[PDB]
Design a protein around this ligand. Structure first.
Ligand SMILES: CCCCCCCCCCCCCC(=O)N[C@@H](CCC(=O)N[C@H](Cc1ccc(O)cc1)C1=NCC[C@@H](C(=O)NCC(N)=O)N1)C(=O)O
Length: 709
């Protein structure tokens, strides 16, 4: 993700300004969806959110605009256990042997001959949490095993937190509602408001260890691999329980980085350190924020944001639509000198020509040099001492830079990496003179739409991640919801797109209408006031009831629903109905995943949208969403949240009762069925653990002791 909040001192109009550009999948449980929610007098906020959630995750209201980026804090800890030398099913805490908890789950699998079979798996849990095995790496042998405590497994405030965010009026109000509830799982928060404040917050759920305990409790080699690993045989290494924290064992708000400014704040998924170099954030816990080099996306943003010139909204827009490969600025000059110097080797002929013609961009009409440059960087990045100016912690904006072509070995190393990378390119039969837009596409039914942008690792702000599928590169994630908000006196003027369009269903009119506009990088008005909404020639209005539940739904262009209701139940009613019309098949599938029933419907020869095999994914979510977990989670929800969720499941089921396949391709499938509120709790918890134990779902299923059946 990228995010830039400009305050009154740097904005051309003297008011707040926010650029929101998260990078998320183009399919599955994390596919963003535009919506505008309104409960008159209490709630009116527009933006985008994740499937199944009756709140807005990134958006804006009349005086405020906020967004999220991934942070560098830890949201879980790996605990290395010391096993009882006489029983690998027992572990030691301060030298005392304790039994491992044993919990059985059962899964149903549909065989090839349609028959059903039951699979039972045992999950072992320590006082820290479930045991995980990364075979070969985090083994369960006779002296040690590994457990994983996910801090968000105990976060029941997650939906209450965003619903509170949706009611925030400005930056001060926003800062209060997040600090008080501490419900954000694993993202930063940046925001601007009409009065010209710019806010950055590393306010999330972070395990708490007092600073003096960290050098002793941390495992150095594993922390060196970026893993938050603690000693699990020492009671002094349990998470510290500060009574000022909203959840037992997490870091209280006052210790997490916050920066309020009137010039600007930015973040492109690095630590809080360089949110604004004029005001560095240092001296925090290493579980919270370290002073490490920033990625090229942040360097690009900071280079363009330097100085004191007033910024226009189109300047923020063009920082994305430019598709500038910022990493070439540090490598391409030296690389082209090498290229001309070696105008003899006929091998390097094609690559050097493409690199010389390359416009240093990732646009649709950018030359094939971008492909050559990409493969070169992958092999240049695995070479120590190749940077002429290596990283200097005192110049982290200008460093590293340049190729040290002066030394004899690196010169022939860089020439070797270029020669290797060039061979890989022509080994794929890519035509001569092919442009980037001819290669990177997004499949829409039977056709392909060219998608500009490139992978963020190369400093492309408009980060686009794709994989090779057949004769092209299929876009899999990246720039999703785009939001650029300013605050003229008339009202919030917002402008953006949903790159993959509102509906994942090919039958829908909103399956590729915004993807075509993204291909041409034509951002559109996001209508918020009733004047813009009601003056749309494409407006469609409809009221629905049952019971009770009622909602007033307006649809503007590209299928963006605007839901008006009297209470949370009716608000959820409209949300569930509108989202089902666009994405009923997506949610039906993801609910089957979060229920642990993929092998029941699709058999064991399949994968989930998370590229997890059907059987291990089922075992994990059966453990994660067992009924005791759902009951305990539900009983911890505020009444408003429970009414939102109840309304959603009703609005979803209301559409299924009327569905005739017009915008629903999975009509007739046995897994397309009415949903309950607990199904929505499963999707929520599935998203919660995505910053922690969810990333270890296969490792949890793999954990078995020596012996055992
Ligand atoms: C109920 C719950 C509801 C939740 C509601 C959530 C609503 C908010 C949505 C969040 C949107 C952010 C997603 C997003 O925007 N991710 C990005 C993540 C991008 C990313 O983080 N990319 C870097 C590499 C990088 C960094 C800086 C650059 O400038 C360029 C590249 C990285 N990726 C892999 C992990 C990590 C790493 O490995 N480094 C540690 C190490 N030791 O090396 N860093 C991506 O999905 O694309």
């Amino acid at each position: 993700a990228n995010a830039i909040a400009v305050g009154s001192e740097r904005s051309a109009d003297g008011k707040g300004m926010l650029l929101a550009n998260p990078h998320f999948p183009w399919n599955g449980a994390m596919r963003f969806y535009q919506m505008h929610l309104t409960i008159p007098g209490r709630l009116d906020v527009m933006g985008a959110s994740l499937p199944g959630l009756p709140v807005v995750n990134i958006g804006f209201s009349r005086h405020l605009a906020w967004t999220h980026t991934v942070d560098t804090s830890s949201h879980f800890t790996l605990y290395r256990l010391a096993l009882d030398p006489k029983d690998p099913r027992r572990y030691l805490v301060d030298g005392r042997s304790l039994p491992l908890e044993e919990k059985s789950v059962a899964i149903e699998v549909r065989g090839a001959d349609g028959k059903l079979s039951r699979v039972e798996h045992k999950v072992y849990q320590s006082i820290y949490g479930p045991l995980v095995v990364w075979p070969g790496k985090l083994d369960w042998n006779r002296s040690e095993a590994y457990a994983l405590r996910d801090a968000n497994l105990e976060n029941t405030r997650v939906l209450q937190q965003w619903y509170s965010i949706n009611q925030a009026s400005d930056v001060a109000d926003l800062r209060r509602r997040v600090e008080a509830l501490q419900g954000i799982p694993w993202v930063n928060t940046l925001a601007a408001d009409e009065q010209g404040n710019a806010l950055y917050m590393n306010q999330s759920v972070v395990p708490y260890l007092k600073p003096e305990l960290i050098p002793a409790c941390a495992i150095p080699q594993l922390v060196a691999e970026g893993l938050p690993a603690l000693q699990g045989q020492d009671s002094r290494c349990a998470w510290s329980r500060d009574p000022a924290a909203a959840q037992a064992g997490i870091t209280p708000a006052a210790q997490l980085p916050v920066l309020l400014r009137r010039d600007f704040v930015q973040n492109s998924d690095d630590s809080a350190w360089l949110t604004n170099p004029a005001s560095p954030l240092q001296g925090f816990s290493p579980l919270v924020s370290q002073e490490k080099p920033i990625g090229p996306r942040a360097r690009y943003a900071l280079s363009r944001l330097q100085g004191k010139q007033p910024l226009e909204a189109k300047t923020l827009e063009e920082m994305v639509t430019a598709n500038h490969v910022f990493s070439a600025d540090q490598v391409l000059p030296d690389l082209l000198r090498l290229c001309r110097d070696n105008q003899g080797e006929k091998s390097l002929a094609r690559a050097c020509a493409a690199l010389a013609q390359w416009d240093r961009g990732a646009n649709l009409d950018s030359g094939s040099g971008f492909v050559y440059f990409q493969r070169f960087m992958q092999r240049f990045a695995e070479l120590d001492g190749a940077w002429k100016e290596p990283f200097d912690a005192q110049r982290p904006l200008d460093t590293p830079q340049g190729i040290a072509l002066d030394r004899p070995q690196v010169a022939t190393q860089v020439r070797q990496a270029l020669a290797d990378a060039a061979a890989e390119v022509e080994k794929s039969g890519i035509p001569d003179g092919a442009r980037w837009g001819d290669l990177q596409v997004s499949t829409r039914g039977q056709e392909r739409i060219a998608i500009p942008g490139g992978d963020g690792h190369f400093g492309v702000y408009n980060a686009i991640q794709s994989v090779r599928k057949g004769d092209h590169l299929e876009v899999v994630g990246g720039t999703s919801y785009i939001q650029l908000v300013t605050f003229p006196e008339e009202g919030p003027k917002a402008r953006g797109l949903l790159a993959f369009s509102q509906s994942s269903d090919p039958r829908s009119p909103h399956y590729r209408d915004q993807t075509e506009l993204f291909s041409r990088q034509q951002w559109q008005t996001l209508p918020f006031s009733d004047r813009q909404i009601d003056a749309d020639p494409q407006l469609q209005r409809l009221s629905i009831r049952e019971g009770g539940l009622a909602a007033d739904i307006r649809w503007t262009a590209y299928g963006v629903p605007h839901i008006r209701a009297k209470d949370e139940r009716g608000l959820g009613y409209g949300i569930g109905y509108a989202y089902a019309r666009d994405n009923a098949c997506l949610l039906a599938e993801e609910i089957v995943t979060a229920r642990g029933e993929r092998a029941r419907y699709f058999g064991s020869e399949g994968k989930s949208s998370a590229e997890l095999d059907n059987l291990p994914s089922d075992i994990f979510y059966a453990w994660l969403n067992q009924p005791e977990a759902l009951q305990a989670f539900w009983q911890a929800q505020t009444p408003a949240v429970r009414q939102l969720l109840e309304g959603y499941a009703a609005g979803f089921n209301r559409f299924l009762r009327e569905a005739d396949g017009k915008t629903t391709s999975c009509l007739g499938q046995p897994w397309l069925r009415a949903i309950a509120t607990d199904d929505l709790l499963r999707l929520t918890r599935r998203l919660l653990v995505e910053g922690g134990v969810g990333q270890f779902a296969d490792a949890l299923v793999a954990a078995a002791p020596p012996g055992a059946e």
